[PDB]
Design a protein around this ligand. Sequence first.
Ligand SMILES: O=C(O)Cc1c[nH]c2ccccc12
Ligand SMILES: O=C(O)Cc1c[nH]c2ccccc12
Lengths: 103, 102
Amino acid sequence: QSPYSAAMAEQRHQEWLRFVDLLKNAYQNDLHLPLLNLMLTPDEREALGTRVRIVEELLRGEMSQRELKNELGAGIATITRGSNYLKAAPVELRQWLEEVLLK
Amino acid sequence: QSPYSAAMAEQRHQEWLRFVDLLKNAYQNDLHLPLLNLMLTPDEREALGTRVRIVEELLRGEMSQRELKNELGAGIATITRGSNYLKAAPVELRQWLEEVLL
Ligand SMILES: O=C(O)Cc1c[nH]c2ccccc12
Ligand SMILES: O=C(O)Cc1c[nH]c2ccccc12
């Protein structure tokens, strides 16, 4: 069926929340590392590691475009998307990220 | 430089573990949902939700290949890779997944 429907949106939402609770329980049982190895490909794990550094440097604000590109391998489009995500983040998350990533 | 180097392997280890620790801390602070919305695109979150069901139905062993494909939209190659990962999973993870998913 069509993925663009309320019913499919609700199904995706429930499946996503199930994964979030599964990983929560994995953390609670010290199984987070093998679970994330199973559920994410190596390139996806590498990308997540890089996106942490992109968010950190965007929040810091000291590197420019070409600096971020040459240091992290992230082109301008990727950086702009990350900046859009950061702009859309709730204030509590952004302030916590400033705290934990920059201090 | 080269992605296929020992130094780059070490950098990958470090950056991945920093993400794992950040997300641990986000769960501890009830910020995991917005952090995951920030670090994963919608299609990646959708894929993760589907991968949970793939792993569940592989462990259950009741659905076949065409059934898994028609129910989850996941082709044979994706199911085969998931089965490979499950075969390579450590015993403790697999027994836990059977405990919690079934
Ligand atoms: O849009 C992308 O290329 C993926 C992506 C998801 N969250 C991000 C945060 C910072 C930089 C890139 C991404
Ligand atoms: O290889 C893939 O297609 C992605 C993938 C990563 N972990 C998985 C678990 C089950 C099914 C597919 C995947």
